[PDB]
Amino acid sequence: AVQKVVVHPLVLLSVVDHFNRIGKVGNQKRVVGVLLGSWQKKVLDVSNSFAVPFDEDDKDDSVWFLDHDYLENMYGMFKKVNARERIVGWYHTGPKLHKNDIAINELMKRYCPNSVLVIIDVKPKDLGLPTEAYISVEEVHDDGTPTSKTFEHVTSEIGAEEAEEVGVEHLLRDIKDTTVGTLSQRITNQVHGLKGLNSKLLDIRSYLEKVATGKLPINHQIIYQLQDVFNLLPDVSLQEFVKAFYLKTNDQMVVVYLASLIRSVVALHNLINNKIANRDAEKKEG
Amino acid sequence: ALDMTTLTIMRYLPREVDPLVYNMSHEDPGNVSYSEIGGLSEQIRELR
Amino acid sequence: MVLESTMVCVDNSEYMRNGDFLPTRLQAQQDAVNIVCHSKTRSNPENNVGLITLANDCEVLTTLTPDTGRILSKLHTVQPKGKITFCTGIRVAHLALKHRQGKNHKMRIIAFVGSPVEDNEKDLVKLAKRLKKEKVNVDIINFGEEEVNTEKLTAFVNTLNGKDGTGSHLVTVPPGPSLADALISSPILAG
Amino acid sequence: AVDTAEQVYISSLALLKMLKHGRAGVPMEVMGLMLGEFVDDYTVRVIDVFAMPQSGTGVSVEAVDPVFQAKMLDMLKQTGRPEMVVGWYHSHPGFGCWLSGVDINTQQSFEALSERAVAVVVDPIQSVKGKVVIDAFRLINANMMVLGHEPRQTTSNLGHLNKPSIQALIHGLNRHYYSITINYRKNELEQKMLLNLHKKSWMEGLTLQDYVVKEMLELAKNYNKAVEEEDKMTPEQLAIKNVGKQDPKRHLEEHVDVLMTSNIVQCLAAMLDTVVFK
Numbered sequence: 001a002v003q004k005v006v007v008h009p010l011v012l013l014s015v016v017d018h019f020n021r022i023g024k025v026g027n028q029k030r031v032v033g034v035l036l037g038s039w040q041k042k043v044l045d046v047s048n049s050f051a052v053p054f055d056e057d058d059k060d061d062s063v064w065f066l067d068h069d070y071l072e073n074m075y076g077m078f079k080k081v082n083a084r085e086r087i088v089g090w091y092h093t094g095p096k097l098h099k100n101d102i103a104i105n106e107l108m109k110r111y112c113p114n115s116v117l118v119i120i121d122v123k124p125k126d127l128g129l130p131t132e133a134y135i136s137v138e139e140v141h142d143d144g145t146p147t148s149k150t151f152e153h154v155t156s157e158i159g160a161e162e163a164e165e166v167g168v169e170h171l172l173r174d175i176k177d178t179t180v181g182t183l184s185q186r187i188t189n190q191v192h193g194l195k196g197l198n199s200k201l202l203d204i205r206s207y208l209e210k211v212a213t214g215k216l217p218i219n220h221q222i223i224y225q226l227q228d229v230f231n232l233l234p235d236v237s238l239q240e241f242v243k244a245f246y247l248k249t250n251d252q253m254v255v256v257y258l259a260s261l262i263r264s265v266v267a268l269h270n271l272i273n274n275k276i277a278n279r280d281a282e283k284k285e286g
Numbered sequence: 287a288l289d290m291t292t293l294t295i296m297r298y299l300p301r302e303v304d305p306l307v308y309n310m311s312h313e314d315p316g317n318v319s320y321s322e323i324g325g326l327s328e329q330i331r332e333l334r
Numbered sequence: 335m336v337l338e339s340t341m342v343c344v345d346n347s348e349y350m351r352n353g354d355f356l357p358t359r360l361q362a363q364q365d366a367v368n369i370v371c372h373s374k375t376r377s378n379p380e381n382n383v384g385l386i387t388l389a390n391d392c393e394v395l396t397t398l399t400p401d402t403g404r405i406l407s408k409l410h411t412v413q414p415k416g417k418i419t420f421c422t423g424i425r426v427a428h429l430a431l432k433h434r435q436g437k438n439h440k441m442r443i444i445a446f447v448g449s450p451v452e453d454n455e456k457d458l459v460k461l462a463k464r465l466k467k468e469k470v471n472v473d474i475i476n477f478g479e480e481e482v483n484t485e486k487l488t489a490f491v492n493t494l495n496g497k498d499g500t501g502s503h504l505v506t507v508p509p510g511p512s513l514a515d516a517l518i519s520s521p522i523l524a525g
Numbered sequence: 526a527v528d529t530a531e532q533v534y535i536s537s538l539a540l541l542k543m544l545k546h547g548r549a550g551v552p553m554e555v556m557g558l559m560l561g562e563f564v565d566d567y568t569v570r571v572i573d574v575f576a577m578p579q580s581g582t583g584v585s586v587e588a589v590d591p592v593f594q595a596k597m598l599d600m601l602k603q604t605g606r607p608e609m610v611v612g613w614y615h616s617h618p619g620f621g622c623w624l625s626g627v628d629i630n631t632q633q634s635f636e637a638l639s640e641r642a643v644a645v646v647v648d649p650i651q652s653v654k655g656k657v658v659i660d661a662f663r664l665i666n667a668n669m670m671v672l673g674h675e676p677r678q679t680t681s682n683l684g685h686l687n688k689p690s691i692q693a694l695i696h697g698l699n700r701h702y703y704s705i706t707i708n709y710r711k712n713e714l715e716q717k718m719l720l721n722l723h724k725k726s727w728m729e730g731l732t733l734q735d736y737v738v739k740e741m742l743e744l745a746k747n748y749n750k751a752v753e754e755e756d757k758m759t760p761e762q763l764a765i766k767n768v769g770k771q772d773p774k775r776h777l778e779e780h781v782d783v784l785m786t787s788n789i790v791q792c793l794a795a796m797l798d799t800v801v802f803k
């Protein structure tokens with residue numbers, strides 16, 4: 001279930017406004033609110049949401065309180081505003097997930113049959129997207145991990161709205177092909193080169209660190225299975241990818257040449273247009 | 287179906303009363319009796 | 335009309351399944367909650383009563399409310415099986431009383447213990463000194479079975495109410511079957 | 526006792542909620558209560574907006590539900606800080622921004638309740654990030670008509686107020702009301718998160734995989750060049766033409782930039798070929 005978790009922009013801002021609303025007290029260190037969304041299809045789209053008062057305590061993460069009245073009264077009044085609107089999950093800040101989250105999740109599971117947790121971060125960073133989607137389920141691990149009850153990551157997306165960035169984007173914006181390949185390539189190299197390395201580095205550190213503190217370097221099949229899928233290319237020595245010679249290398253030259261030959265023709269049009277523009281039009285002494 | 291404010295296609299639904307078309311459709315009945323007036327010498331022979 | 339809100343802690347456990355008190359210990363516990371809610375209602379209509387199991391899970395069964403109808407429904411289908419976890423429940427109950435917007439209402443906790451609690455006595459005593467700083471009265475009626483003499487709880491109550499404190503009465507389960515009315519009289523007589 | 530060109534600051538959350546609620550109720554002209562802050566007469570900021578449940582009566586004062594307001598306010602008190610509502614916000618779909626006698630009757634009740642009583646009129650006419658069809662209006666008293674309606678201590682703010690000016694439909698019912706300037710309330714981290722969620726999220730910013738590229742490109746490059754071969758004939762005509770009298774020659778066919786960007790970005794895939802991977 002929960003195949004994708006689109007989150008509407010209005011909800012994305014709503015979490016930040018709540019953090020400012022409780023900004024007077026920094027003790028909570030997270031913002032918790034009921035997440036209301038419509039299960040129109042397997043895709044889950046979050047819509048207008050409200051924040052239930054909640055306290056998370058460092059003492060064994062067992063001192064957690066959710067007001068039944070606030071959740072019930074606000075949801076009913078909000079449902080009166082939108083029939084489509086229904087409880088679909090809950091949202092919290094605190095990017096590192098607290099151990100208490102699973103206990104809060106069980107109460108969330110009771111309210112909604114297939115509820116989801118969105119770890120939206122009020123302070124945005126760089127890369128990916130602000131919302132993190134986790135669904136907690138109970139199952140027997142095939143290998144045999146005890147209990148095997150944990151949140152599972154799900155794909156997350158941004159919702160569609162109209163006249164929303166007139167408040168924000170109007171000041172800036174860069175909607176053109178002018179910056180494509182000028183800075184866009186730099187951003188991908190900036191993150192795939194560093195952020196992609198950082199997650200792999202976390203696993204390479206985990207070879208000893210997962211032994212030291214991690215669940216296990218040899219654990220979570222996808223640690224090796226997904227990495228091996230990423231190593232669709234061999235990764236070292238002969239490779240047989242760009243070293244194909246008769247294959248990819250020969251093709252790279254044909255396309256690069258066909259692309260390059262236009263540029264010689266392209267220069268001809270641009271140069272002559274300049275010559276008419278300055279040599280004749282500028283030269284008008286009269 | 288066209289949205290009241292958006293004026294964009296919402297769903298495909300085909301329902302037409304078609305009263306004149308119904309006359310041109312299956313309005314004509316078929317007589318079950320093989321020989322209502324008999325006289326089937328070529329009716330169930332040459333015509334069949 | 336004295337204003338008070340009580341976060342009672344109910345117990346649901348295999349021990350509660352035992353029916354030595356009345357036909358069933360759980361039914362007797364429900365009856366005890368009924369009288370306290372009626373007593374609070376007689377004292378003031380606005381008085382809020384809320385309850386939660388202190389065994390295995392210690393969340394909020396019902397948010398504190400002036401109407402007792404929610405309290406009765408929560409008592410129905412309580413379902414007993416979880417092992418008692420009084421320390422987590424007592425901490426939750428005290429903070430939950432602070433959580434209520436109407437802190438003007440006096441804060442009190444009444445709890446029922448059906449099974450011995452496997453906790454360090456020092457750890458509960460440390461909670462009890464914190465409860466004394468919070469200054470919220472807590473009275474516990476042990477039901478059916480309890481740690482022998484409720485020694486840790488007796489020390490916990492003394493730490494909670496020391497230095498000429500409220501000294502809220504702690505009721506150890508009367509041995510064998512106990513009438514609900516006998517259980518109700520001690521809290522009515524004194525906190 | 527003297528009105529001024531006061532500024533109404535709309536928080537992003539209030540504006541986003543108003544348009545979304547308005548779009549849902551555009552056929553039935555939905556109405557709502559604006560949870561504004563009366564910090565001072567010169568500056569009024571609407572920190573929050575909440576939507577009244579749809580009411581059969583309409584945008585009228587009777588439609589507003591007193592019980593809903595009290596319970597909603599209590600929820601605001603428990604979670605975060607509540608603020609006294611500045612006035613009623615509502616949507617008139619037929620006439621972008623406009624004022625009505627029915628509207629004044631509710632506005633008068635809100636004016637009696639408080640002071641500024643700001644009224645907002647969002648509508649379905651919209652643009653992706655450039656419409657702002659919403660406008661704010663405050664009634665002017667008939668007794669106040671003898672006095673100057675809005676004495677101005679600041680010329681520049683009146684000039685900023687002058688830039689919107691008046692709408693022709695609004696002009697028809699302008700008398701007995703005065704337009705009040707509306708500006709977006711300061712947005713900082715709020716602007717930053719949407720800014721982070723624009724090029725990275727609203728626009729395509731996978732970034733890890735942001736960088737067709739070699740499959741249909743050959744068709745597009747041949748087609749645009751073919752258009753140029755026909756188009757360049759018009760520049761060939763201009764150079765041959767004596768053009769003693771200036772005449773349009775269909776020059777600036779351009780497409781040179783379009784060809785340049787497409788060929789270069791595809792050629793930049795060489796970085797993916799030998800650097801991003803092996």
Ligand SMILES: [Zn+2]
Binds near residue numbers: 628
């Ligand atoms: Zn109106």
